[PDB]
PDB file of C-alpha atoms and ligand atoms in Angstrom:
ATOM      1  CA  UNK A   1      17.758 -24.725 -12.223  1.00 58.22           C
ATOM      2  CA  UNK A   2      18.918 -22.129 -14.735  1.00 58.23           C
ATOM      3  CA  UNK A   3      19.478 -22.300 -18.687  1.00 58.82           C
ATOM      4  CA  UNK A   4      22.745 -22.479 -19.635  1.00 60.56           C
ATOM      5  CA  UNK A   5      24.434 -22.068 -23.244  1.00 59.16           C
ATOM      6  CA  UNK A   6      26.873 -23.447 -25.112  1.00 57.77           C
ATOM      7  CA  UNK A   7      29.883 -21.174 -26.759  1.00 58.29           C
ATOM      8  CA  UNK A   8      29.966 -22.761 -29.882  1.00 61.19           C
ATOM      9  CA  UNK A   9      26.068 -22.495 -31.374  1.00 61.04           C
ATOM     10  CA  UNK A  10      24.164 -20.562 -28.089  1.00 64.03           C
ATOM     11  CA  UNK A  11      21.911 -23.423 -28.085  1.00 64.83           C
ATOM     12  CA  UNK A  12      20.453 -24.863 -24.589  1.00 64.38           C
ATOM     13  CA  UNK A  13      22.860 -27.481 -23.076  1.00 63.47           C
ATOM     14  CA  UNK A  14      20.796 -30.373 -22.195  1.00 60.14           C
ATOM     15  CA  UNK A  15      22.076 -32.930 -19.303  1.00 59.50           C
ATOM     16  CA  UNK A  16      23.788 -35.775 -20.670  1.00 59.00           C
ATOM     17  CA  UNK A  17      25.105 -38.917 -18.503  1.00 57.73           C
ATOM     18  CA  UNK A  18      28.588 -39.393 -18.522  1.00 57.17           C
ATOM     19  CA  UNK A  19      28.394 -43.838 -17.303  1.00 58.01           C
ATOM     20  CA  UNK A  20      32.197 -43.756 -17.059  1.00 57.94           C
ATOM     21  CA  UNK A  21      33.635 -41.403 -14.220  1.00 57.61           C
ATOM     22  CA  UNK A  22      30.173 -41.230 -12.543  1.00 56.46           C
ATOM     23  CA  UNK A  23      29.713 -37.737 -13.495  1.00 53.27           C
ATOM     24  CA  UNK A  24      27.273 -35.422 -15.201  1.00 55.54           C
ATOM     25  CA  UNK A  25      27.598 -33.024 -18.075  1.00 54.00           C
ATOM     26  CA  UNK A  26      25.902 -30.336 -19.998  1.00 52.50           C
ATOM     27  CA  UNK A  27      25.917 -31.200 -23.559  1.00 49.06           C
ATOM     28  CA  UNK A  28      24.131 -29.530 -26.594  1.00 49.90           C
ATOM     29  CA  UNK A  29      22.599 -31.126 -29.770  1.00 52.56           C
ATOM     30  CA  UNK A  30      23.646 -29.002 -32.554  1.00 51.45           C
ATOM     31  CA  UNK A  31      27.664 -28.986 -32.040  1.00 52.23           C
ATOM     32  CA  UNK A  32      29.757 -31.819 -29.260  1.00 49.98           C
ATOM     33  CA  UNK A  33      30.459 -28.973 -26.568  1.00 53.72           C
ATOM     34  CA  UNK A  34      30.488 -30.378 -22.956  1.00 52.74           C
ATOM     35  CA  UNK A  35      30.652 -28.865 -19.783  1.00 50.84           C
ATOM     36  CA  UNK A  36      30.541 -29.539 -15.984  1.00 51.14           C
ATOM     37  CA  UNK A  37      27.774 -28.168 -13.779  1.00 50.92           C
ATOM     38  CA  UNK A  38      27.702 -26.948 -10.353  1.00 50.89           C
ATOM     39  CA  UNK A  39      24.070 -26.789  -8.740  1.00 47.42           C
ATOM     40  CA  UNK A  40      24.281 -30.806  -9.179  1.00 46.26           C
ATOM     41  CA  UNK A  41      20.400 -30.272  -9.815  1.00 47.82           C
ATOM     42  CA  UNK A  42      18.526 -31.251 -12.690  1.00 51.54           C
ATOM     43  CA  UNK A  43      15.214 -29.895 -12.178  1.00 51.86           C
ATOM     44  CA  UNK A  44      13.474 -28.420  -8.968  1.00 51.37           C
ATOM     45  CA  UNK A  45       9.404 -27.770  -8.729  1.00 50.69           C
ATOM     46  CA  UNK A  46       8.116 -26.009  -5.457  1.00 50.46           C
ATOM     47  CA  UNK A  47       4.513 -25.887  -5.472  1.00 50.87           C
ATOM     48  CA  UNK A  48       3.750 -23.793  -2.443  1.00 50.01           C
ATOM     49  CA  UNK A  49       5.632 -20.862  -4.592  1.00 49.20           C
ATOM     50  CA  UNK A  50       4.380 -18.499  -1.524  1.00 48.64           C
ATOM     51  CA  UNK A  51       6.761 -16.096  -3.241  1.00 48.57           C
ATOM     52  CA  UNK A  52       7.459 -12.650  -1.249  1.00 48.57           C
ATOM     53  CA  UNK A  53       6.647  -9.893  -3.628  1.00 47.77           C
ATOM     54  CA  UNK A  54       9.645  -7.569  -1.610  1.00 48.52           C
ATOM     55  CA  UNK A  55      11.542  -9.034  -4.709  1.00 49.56           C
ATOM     56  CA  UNK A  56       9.256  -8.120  -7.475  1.00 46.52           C
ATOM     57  CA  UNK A  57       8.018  -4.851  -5.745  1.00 47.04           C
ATOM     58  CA  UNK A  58       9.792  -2.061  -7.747  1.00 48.94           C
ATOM     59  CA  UNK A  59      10.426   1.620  -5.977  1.00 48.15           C
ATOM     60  CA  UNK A  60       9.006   3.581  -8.424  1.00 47.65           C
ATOM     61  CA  UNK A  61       5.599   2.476  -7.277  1.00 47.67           C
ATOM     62  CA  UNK A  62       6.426   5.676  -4.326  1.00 48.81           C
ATOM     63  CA  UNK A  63       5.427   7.997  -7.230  1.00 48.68           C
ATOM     64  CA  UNK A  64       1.588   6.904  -7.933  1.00 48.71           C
ATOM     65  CA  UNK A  65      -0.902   9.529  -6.873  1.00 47.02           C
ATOM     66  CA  UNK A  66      -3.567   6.687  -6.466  1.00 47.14           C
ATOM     67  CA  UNK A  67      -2.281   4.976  -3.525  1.00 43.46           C
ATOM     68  CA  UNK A  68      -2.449   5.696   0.317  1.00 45.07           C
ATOM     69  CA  UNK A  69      -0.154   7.431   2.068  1.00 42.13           C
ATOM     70  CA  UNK A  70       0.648   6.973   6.105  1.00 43.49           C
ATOM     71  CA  UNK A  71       2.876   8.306   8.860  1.00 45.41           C
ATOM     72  CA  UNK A  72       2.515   6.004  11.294  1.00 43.84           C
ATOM     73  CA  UNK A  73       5.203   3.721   9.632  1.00 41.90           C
ATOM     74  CA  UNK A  74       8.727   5.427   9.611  1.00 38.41           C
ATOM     75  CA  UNK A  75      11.357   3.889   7.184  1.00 36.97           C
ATOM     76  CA  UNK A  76      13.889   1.373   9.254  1.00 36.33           C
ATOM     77  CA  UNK A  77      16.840   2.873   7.003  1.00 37.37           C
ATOM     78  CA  UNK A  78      16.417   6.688   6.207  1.00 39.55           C
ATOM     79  CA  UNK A  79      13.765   7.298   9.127  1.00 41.57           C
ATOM     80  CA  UNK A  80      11.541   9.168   6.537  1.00 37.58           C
ATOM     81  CA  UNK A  81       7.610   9.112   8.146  1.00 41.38           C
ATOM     82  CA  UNK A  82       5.760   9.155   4.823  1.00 41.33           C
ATOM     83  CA  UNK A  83       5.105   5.594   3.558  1.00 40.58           C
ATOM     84  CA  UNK A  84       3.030   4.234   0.606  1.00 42.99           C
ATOM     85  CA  UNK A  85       1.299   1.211   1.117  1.00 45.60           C
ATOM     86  CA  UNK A  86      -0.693  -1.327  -0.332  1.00 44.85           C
ATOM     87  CA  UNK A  87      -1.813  -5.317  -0.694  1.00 45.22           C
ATOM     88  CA  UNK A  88      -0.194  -8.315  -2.156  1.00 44.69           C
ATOM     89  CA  UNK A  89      -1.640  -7.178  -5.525  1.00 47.37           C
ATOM     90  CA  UNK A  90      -0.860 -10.956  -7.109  1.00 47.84           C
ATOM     91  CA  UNK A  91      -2.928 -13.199  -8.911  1.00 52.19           C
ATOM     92  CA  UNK A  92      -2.965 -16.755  -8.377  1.00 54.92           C
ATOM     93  CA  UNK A  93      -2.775 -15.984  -4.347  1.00 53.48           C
ATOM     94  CA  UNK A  94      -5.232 -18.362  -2.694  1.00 51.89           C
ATOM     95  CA  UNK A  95      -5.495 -16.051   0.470  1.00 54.27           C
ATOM     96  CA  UNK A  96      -3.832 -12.844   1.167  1.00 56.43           C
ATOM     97  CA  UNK A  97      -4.888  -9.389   2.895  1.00 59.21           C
ATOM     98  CA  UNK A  98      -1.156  -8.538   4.091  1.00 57.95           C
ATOM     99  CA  UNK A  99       0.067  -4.819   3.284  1.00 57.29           C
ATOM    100  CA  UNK A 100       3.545  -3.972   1.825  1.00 58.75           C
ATOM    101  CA  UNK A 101       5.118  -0.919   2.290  1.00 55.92           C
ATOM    102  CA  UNK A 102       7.618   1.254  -0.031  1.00 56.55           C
ATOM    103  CA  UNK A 103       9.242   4.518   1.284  1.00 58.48           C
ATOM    104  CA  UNK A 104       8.626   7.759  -0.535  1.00 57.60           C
ATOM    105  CA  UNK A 105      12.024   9.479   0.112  1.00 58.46           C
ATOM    106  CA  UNK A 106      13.916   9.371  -3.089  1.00 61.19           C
ATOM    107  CA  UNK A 107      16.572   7.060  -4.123  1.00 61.11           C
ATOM    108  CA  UNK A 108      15.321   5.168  -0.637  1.00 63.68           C
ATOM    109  CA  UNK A 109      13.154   2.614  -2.439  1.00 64.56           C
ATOM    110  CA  UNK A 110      13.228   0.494   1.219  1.00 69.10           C
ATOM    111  CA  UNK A 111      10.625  -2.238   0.747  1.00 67.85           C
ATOM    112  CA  UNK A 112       9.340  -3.927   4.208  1.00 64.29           C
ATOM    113  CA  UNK A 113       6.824  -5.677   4.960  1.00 64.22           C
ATOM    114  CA  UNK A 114       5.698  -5.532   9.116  1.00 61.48           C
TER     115      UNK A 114
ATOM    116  CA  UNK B   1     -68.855  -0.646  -3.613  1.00 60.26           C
ATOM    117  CA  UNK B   2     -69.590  -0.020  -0.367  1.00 61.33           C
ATOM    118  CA  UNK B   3     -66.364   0.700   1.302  1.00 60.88           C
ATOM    119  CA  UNK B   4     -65.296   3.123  -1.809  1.00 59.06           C
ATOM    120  CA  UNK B   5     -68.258   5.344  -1.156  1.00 56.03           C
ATOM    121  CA  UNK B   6     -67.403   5.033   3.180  1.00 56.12           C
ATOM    122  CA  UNK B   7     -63.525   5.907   1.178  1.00 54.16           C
ATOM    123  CA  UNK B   8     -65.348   9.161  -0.326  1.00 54.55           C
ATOM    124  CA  UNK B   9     -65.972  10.163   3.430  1.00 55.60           C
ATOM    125  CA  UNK B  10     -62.749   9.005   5.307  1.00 55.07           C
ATOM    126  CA  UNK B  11     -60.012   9.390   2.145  1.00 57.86           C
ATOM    127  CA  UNK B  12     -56.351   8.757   1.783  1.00 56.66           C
ATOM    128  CA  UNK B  13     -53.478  10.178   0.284  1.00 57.32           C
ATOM    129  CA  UNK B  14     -49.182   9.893   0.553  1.00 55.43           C
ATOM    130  CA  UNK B  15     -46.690  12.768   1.374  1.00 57.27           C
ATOM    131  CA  UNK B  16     -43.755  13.572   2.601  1.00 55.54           C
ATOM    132  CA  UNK B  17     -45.091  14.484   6.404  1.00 56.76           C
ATOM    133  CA  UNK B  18     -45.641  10.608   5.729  1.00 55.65           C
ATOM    134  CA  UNK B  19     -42.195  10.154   4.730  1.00 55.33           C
ATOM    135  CA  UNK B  20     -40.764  12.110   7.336  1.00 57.34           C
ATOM    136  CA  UNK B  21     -39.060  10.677  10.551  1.00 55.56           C
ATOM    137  CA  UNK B  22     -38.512  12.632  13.914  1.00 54.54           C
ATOM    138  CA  UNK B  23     -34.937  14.515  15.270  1.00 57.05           C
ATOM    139  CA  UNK B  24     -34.485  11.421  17.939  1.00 57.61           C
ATOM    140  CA  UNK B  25     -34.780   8.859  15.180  1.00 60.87           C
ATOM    141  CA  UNK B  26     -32.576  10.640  12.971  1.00 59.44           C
ATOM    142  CA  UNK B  27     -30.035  10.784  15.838  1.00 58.11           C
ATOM    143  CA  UNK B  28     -30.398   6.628  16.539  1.00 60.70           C
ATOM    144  CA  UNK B  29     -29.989   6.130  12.535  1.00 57.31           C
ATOM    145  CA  UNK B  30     -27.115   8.080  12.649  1.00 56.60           C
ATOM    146  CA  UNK B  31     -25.364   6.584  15.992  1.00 55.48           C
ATOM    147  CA  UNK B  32     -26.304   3.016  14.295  1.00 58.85           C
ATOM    148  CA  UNK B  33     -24.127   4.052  10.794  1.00 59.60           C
ATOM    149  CA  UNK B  34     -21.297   5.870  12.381  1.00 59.57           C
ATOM    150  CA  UNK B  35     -21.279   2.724  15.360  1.00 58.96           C
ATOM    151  CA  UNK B  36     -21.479   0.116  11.719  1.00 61.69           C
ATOM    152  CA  UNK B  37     -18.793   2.373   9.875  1.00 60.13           C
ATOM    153  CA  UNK B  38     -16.408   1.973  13.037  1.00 59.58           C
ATOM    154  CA  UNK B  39     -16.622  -1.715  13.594  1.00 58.39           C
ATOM    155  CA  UNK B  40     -15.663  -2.043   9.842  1.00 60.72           C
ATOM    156  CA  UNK B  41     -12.844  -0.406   9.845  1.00 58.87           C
ATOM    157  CA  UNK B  42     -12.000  -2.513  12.500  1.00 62.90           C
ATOM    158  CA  UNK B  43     -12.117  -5.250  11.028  1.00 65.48           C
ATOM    159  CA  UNK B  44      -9.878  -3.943   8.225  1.00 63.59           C
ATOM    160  CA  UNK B  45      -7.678  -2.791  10.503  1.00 60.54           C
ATOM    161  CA  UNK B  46      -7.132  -6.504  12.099  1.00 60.90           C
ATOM    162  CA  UNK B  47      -7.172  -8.144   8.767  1.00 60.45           C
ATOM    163  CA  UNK B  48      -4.173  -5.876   7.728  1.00 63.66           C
TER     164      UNK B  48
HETATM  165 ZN1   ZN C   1      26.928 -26.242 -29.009  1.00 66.13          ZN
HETATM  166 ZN1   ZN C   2      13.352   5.335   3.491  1.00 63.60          ZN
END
């Protein structure tokens, strides 16, 4: 999945066959440092990629004087009422209307989604 | 010709007591926005 680098020239270590003890390694081009590899994976592709933004949703979004407020929607961990909320805001979403919420109390930064 | 001269008789003109509804119709345009306003909001709502 990842990038991983050798030690010796922190160039990208690119799968190499190892046709004797069935086995794969990570080898670079520019020096002969090998390596064994755990995720056993060379490549992965998802193409639904219906990511959840709860990930990429940062907390100090709870400080923009532009969004809408509610408190209707207490926090699940500190019980604060006041919420910010607002939509998927991603491109490259074929359909989405669902709302995300962020909690205003500071140092919460509890992102849900209901 | 002969209607414009009958027009110097009858005449016409355009004004705001022609532009000017009644209290009930204002009331029934009013109901009618507030009533559309609602049901859009609804629909927000249950899209959300
Ligand atoms: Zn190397
Ligand atoms: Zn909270």
């Amino acid at each position: 999945v990842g990038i991983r680098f050798c030690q010796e020239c922190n160039n990208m270590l690119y799968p190499k066959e190892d046709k004797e003890n069935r086995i794969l390694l990570y080898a670079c081009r520019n020096c002969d440092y090998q390596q064994e590899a755990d995720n056993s994976c060379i490549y992965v592709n998802k193409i639904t990629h219906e990511v959840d933004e709860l990930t990429q949703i940062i907390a100090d979004v709870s400080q923009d004087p532009t969004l809408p407020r509610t408190e209707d929607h207490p926090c699940q961990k500190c019980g604060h009422k006041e919420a910010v909320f607002f939509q998927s805001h991603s491109a490259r979403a074929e359909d989405a209307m669902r709302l995300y919420y962020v909690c205003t109390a500071p140092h919460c930064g509890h992102r849900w989604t209901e | 010709t002969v209607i414009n001269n009958w027009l110097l008789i009858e005449g016409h003109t355009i004004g705001i007591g022609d532009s000017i509804a009644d209290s009930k119709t204002y009331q029934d345009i009013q109901n009618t926005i507030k009533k559309a306003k609602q049901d859009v909001i609804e629909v927000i709502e249950k899209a959300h």
